[PDB]
Amino acid sequence: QCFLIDKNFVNKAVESANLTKDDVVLEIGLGKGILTEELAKNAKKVYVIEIDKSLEPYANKLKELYNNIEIIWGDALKVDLNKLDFNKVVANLPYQISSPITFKLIKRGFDLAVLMYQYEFAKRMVAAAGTKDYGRLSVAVQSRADVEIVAKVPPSAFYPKPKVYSAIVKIKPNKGKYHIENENFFDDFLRAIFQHRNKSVRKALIDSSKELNYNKDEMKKILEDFLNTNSEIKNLINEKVFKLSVKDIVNLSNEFYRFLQNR
Ligand SMILES: Nc1ncnc2c1ncn2[C@@H]1O[C@H](COP(=O)(O)O)[C@@H](O)[C@H]1O
Fold first, then answer.
1. Peptide bond before residue 100 is cis, with ω within 30 degrees of 0
2. Ordered DSSP codes for 8-70
3. Which fold does the domain 178-263 belong to in CATH?
4. What span, in angstroms and rounded, lies between the C-alpha atoms of 42 and 21?
5. Does ligand 1 have an atom closer than 6 angstroms to the CB of 75?
6. Which residues in the chain are classed under CATH 3.40.50.150?
7. Choosing a second label site near 127 at 20 to 30 A (CA), which of 21, 29, 118, 168?
């Protein structure tokens, strides 16, 4: 485990979280408890989910100085987050859980999260439409939250030093900006189209038709009919998947959902 040791990066994360004594913070991963201490100083209460009980002496040290820290010994991917009353999340994430934890957290909901990821993952999360790093992850996150990289974090900020840079990412859920009609269909639609990111949406959907439970012939005919509904749809489905904006992918998928349900 590469512990975050550089207090300057702890400070940047904590600052980005805009904490007050009315906030309740979830942290994932205890590490040395440096970040934990700063959270406890500034927030009402902090929950820490930590899988490795050999880190208990760090927990015990903290609990001597702070009365507002609760340690949950367990797997963050398994814990029922619905049962905890946090409004913010601040963590140097265990990188291996980056994707599922992000969506688990977003599903549960929060006012704001400030999370450290490996740099390449963060770049993908925030990537602009039509760029090399833009993909399913980018749209999956940006359709649900405003995201931005707060700071790049060098290997030297950790001990032992990792092989790659990390990045602090601020995530602010934003449900009403894009308004997903049906989350499960949206998820299936994203999966299908990003299996062929350099093809037109139309051709991607045909190739991946089985991801939406249609055979290739069915899907071809569906899209013929769909394209005839209006000129905007025609223009969207003929563009390359990775070139459509998040707004356009959300609206296209919403329209397609409504189309299929009507049919
Ligand atoms: N799924 C998990 N839930 C809670 N804590 C974890 C989980 N996975 C790893 N950790 C802890 O987070 C620390 C950072 O993860 P890692 O740097 O990927 O080894 C590790 O030392 C573990 O103690």
1. no
2. HHHHHHHHHTT--TT-EEEEE--TTSHHHHHHHHHSSEEEEEES-GGGHHHHHHHHHH-SSEE
3. Helicase, Ruva Protein; domain 3 (1.10.8)
4. 6
5. yes
6. 1-177
7. 29
Ligand 1 pocket mutation pick from 32, 50, 54, 115 by most atoms within 8 angstroms of CB: 50
Q: How far is the CA of 64 from the centre of ligand 1 (A)?
A: 23
The CA 129 to ligand 1 mean position distance, Å, reads 32
Kindly state if the Cβ of 29 falls inside 6 Å of ligand 1. Answer: yes
All CATH 1.10.8.100 domain ranges in the chain, comma separated:
178-263
- What was the elucidation method? X-ray
User: Is beta strand 158-159 parallel, antiparallel or unpaired with respect to 145-153?
Assistant: unpaired
Distance in Å, CA 106 to ligand 1 centroid: 19
Written as one letter, the residue type at 14 is: V
Label residue 228 exposed, middle or buried (CB < 10 Å: 0-12, 13-18, 19+): exposed
Contact 159 CB / ligand 1 (< 6 Å): no
For residue 96, give the ligand 1 atom closest to its CA. 18
CATH topology of domain 1-177: Rossmann fold (3.40.50)
Answer yes or no: is 75 a known binding residue. Answer: yes
* Residue 254 assigned to a binding site: no
48 burial via Cβ count (<10 Å: 0-12, 13-18, 19+)? buried
